[PDB]
């Protein structure tokens, strides 16, 4: 019943080769729904989900402006941060920024975020209460104070507690059908020997949305992680996701190692095994 | 001490010429800016530079060509001139970072620029000082001197009162803007007035020296002065008076 | 992309309140500074507003923000003669983005006048350059001076000098001309004071 809006920002500096490359993407839950790529031609914010296409010109003009302004800022920062860390103007660097808001089944504000990173490492970020800051190093320490005094939180928070959440609601219902669906995992199992007399056992989860899912292999009263090899949940490109968990097993007791598959959209949790 | 400096002060040439303006700040700032302030005092941002990197561009009549060599310097070369460049161009600098924590933009003194169809209607001013009437010296025991700086074009003057070799501000009032001597014309010369009021006793003492001194900004050491005329070079035009009894 | 500054000009007595009201047209602006431009010189920040705070005040000047309605205002309470300037209000979206200025407001703080001893005196010179010039000095703030109906009689606008040692302020105007027909007696068109003007 939880939901979320989450914007993702990556600008990466191209010394000598023009401006920095700037990629921005928007998400509700685990659907992507808008994007911006500076190298792209249109130089506007773009839809990536049907229910947003609904939105009129001012929305799109608007979102185009703000996201451009996002990069101008990131661009300034890129220099500022060279300064802060004392860095050659000849190296390239990466600034990342993500923020957003979470709501509950009541669609009211739950949580807020706003975090920042230089060269893929924590810099500063907004703390849980949307009022103070956590700086990761000496440089961001500078920025903390300056922001505290500059009243940065006070604004970000009104967005995160308010306009962020207002809209996340607006989206959820205009995207009534895509966003609140609950596609459950199409599971099965496989056998691969390797060995000759042990054998790997592979529990598959497919076509499921959202991406939150648990795959465990077992005792036969309860669990196992000797070799429950598990791979990163991965996208299919149709909006759904995939995962698997695996155990290498002795060859004639395949028949007391089960696999459990918990997920939303499953009424009751699935237990699954190879007879 | 510290500031946003900007040269030249004034400048005057004619259509389709080439002129360049500079600016500098040792405030230690991120950003520098260029604004055009037109005939009716409206400010419009033109360009900006964060660390050599150009941000704001607005619209580029690409005659207009900025250039920011380092963080502390910022120049604007203008090519093929416009009567409508007749504006005042303002360098500025801010500091982006920490929010920006400090938001204010610091302005330079502006580079005034008037561009003409024809430089022959340029003239330096005549300066008259007038010694106070004895009327007011009785009726108030105070003495107003009046200075008249007249017959100049364009409006590029700086009038000042020097009393006994020091520049005087107290008791001074200078006309806020000039009068056009013929309000009918486009080419009209100008006329400026100023007022130094002193003690009557101060006036009555001829070891006291009054000078009204008007700086004119005109033609430089390259033009085409072809005529039975001065050549309105940037110059100063002074006029004196002494106390009586 | 637009900011409306009202009014264009504004006169206030040395005591009263001066209020300039500005309206920006953007609604995502969140920074609103006011710039003081003394005399064709470099504009200077007197006061700005960020946070949300619907009132930022510093001694004798204060700012209001009513951002839903899209307007913000400068208040000059406690006026004084120095306060005279052209004031500019601006709005931006903060960060690396452009400030937008209003038309700016031309503020005259008319001074409170002494013991008005109005008069029109005539001065002469040391001479090359023609004229006598006539001086309409000392009058009080409630006199307005208009111009001539001549092409050859020059009259300047009202003006205030401050003899700072003797805490004395006084107005005046200048008037000069070519005419053998000139003289100060009727040199000033206008509605003078009643007319006490000492006319020696």
């Amino acid at each position: 019943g939880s939901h979320s809006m989450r914007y993702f920002f990556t600008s990466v500096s191209r010394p000598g080769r023009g401006e920095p490359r700037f990629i921005a993407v928007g998400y509700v839950d685990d659907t992507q729904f808008v994007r911006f790529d500076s190298d792209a031609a249109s130089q506007r914010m773009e839809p990536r989900a049907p229910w947003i296409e609904q939105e009129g010109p001012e929305y799109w003009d608007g979102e185009t402006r703000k996201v451009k302004a996002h990069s101008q800022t990131h661009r300034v920062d890129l220099g500022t941060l060279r300064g802060y860390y004392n860095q050659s103007e000849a190296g390239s660097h990466t600034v990342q920024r993500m923020y957003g808001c979470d709501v509950g089944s009541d669609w009211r504000f739950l949580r807020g975020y706003h975090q920042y990173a230089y060269d893929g490492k924590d810099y500063i970020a907004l703390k849980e209460d949307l009022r103070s800051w956590t700086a990761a190093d000496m440089a961001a320490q500078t920025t903390k104070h300056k922001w505290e005094a500059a009243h940065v939180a006070e604004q970000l928070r009104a967005y995160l507690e308010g306009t962020c959440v207002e809209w996340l609601r607006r989206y959820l219902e205009n995207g009534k059908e895509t966003l609140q669906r609950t596609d459950a995992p199409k599971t099965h199992m496989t056998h691969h020997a390797v060995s000759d007399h042990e054998a790997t056992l592979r529990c598959w989860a497919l076509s499921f949305y959202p991406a939150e899912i648990t795959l465990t292999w077992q005792r036969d009263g309860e669990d196992q992680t000797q070799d429950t090899e598990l791979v990163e949940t991965r996208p299919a490109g149709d909006g759904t996701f995939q995962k698997w968990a695996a155990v290498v097993v002795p060859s004639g007791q395949e028949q007391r190692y089960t696999c459990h598959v918990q997920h939303e959209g499953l009424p009751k949790p699935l237990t699954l095994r190879w007879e | 001490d510290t500031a946003v400096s900007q040269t030249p002060k004034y400048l005057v040439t004619q259509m389709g010429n080439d002129k360049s303006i500079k600016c500098e700040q040792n405030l230690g700032h991120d950003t520098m800016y260029w604004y055009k302030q037109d005939s009716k005092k409206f400010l419009k941002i033109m360009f900006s530079y964060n660390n050599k990197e150009l941000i704001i561009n607005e619209t580029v009549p690409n005659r207009f060509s900025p250039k920011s060599p380092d963080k502390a310097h910022l120049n604007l070369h203008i090519n093929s001139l416009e009567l409508g460049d007749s504006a005042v161009y303002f360098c500025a600098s801010s500091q982006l970072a920490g929010g920006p924590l400090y938001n204010e933009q610091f302005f330079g003194p502006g580079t005034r620029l008037t561009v003409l169809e024809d430089l022959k209607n340029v003239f330096p001013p005549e300066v008259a000082v007038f010694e106070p009437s004895e009327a007011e010296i009785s009726h108030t025991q105070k003495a107003t001197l009046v200075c008249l700086a007249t017959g100049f074009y364009p409006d590029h003057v700086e009038l000042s009162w020097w009393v006994n070799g020091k520049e005087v501000h107290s008791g001074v009032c200078t006309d806020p803007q000039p009068l056009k001597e013929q309000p009918a014309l486009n080419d009209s010369r100008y006329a400026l007035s100023s007022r130094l009021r002193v003690s009557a006793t101060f006036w009555q003492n001829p070891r006291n020296h009054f000078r009204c001194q008007v700086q004119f900004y005109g033609l430089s050491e390259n033009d085409e002065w072809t005529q039975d005329r001065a050549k309105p070079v940037t110059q100063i035009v002074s006029a004196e008076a002494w106390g009586r009894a | 992309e637009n900011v409306e500054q009202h009014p264009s000009t504004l006169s206030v007595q040395e005591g009263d309140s001066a209020v300039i009201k500005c309206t920006y047209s953007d609604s995502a602006s969140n920074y609103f500074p006011w710039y003081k431009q003394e005399l064709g010189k470099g504009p200077q920040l007197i006061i700005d507003i960020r946070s949300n705070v619907g009132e930022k005040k510093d001694q004798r000047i204060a700012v209001t923000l009513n951002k839903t309605a899209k307007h913000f205002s400068l208040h000059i309470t406690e006026t004084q003669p120095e306060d005279s300037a052209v004031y500019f209000c601006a709005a931006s979206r903060g960060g690396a983005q452009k400030l937008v200025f209003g038309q700016g407001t031309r503020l005259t703080i008319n001074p409170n006048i002494q013991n008005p001893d109005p008069a029109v005196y005539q001065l002469r010179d040391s001479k090359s350059s023609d004229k006598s010039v006539c001086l309409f000095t000392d009058f009080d703030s409630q006199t307005n001076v208009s111009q001539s109906k001549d092409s050859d009689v020059y009259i300047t606008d009202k003006c205030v000098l401050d003899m700072r040692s003797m805490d004395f302020k006084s107005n005046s105007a200048v008037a000069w001309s070519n005419k053998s027909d000139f003289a100060c007696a009727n040199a000033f068109n206008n509605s003078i004071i009643p007319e006490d003007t000492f006319f020696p």
């Binding site: 703000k66 800022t73 970000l156 | - | -």
Partner: peptide, 9 residues
């Protein structure tokens, strides 16, 4: 929406 305000490190 996406943020109308954004600070400068």
């Amino acid at each position: 929406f996406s943020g109308e305000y954004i600070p400068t490190v």
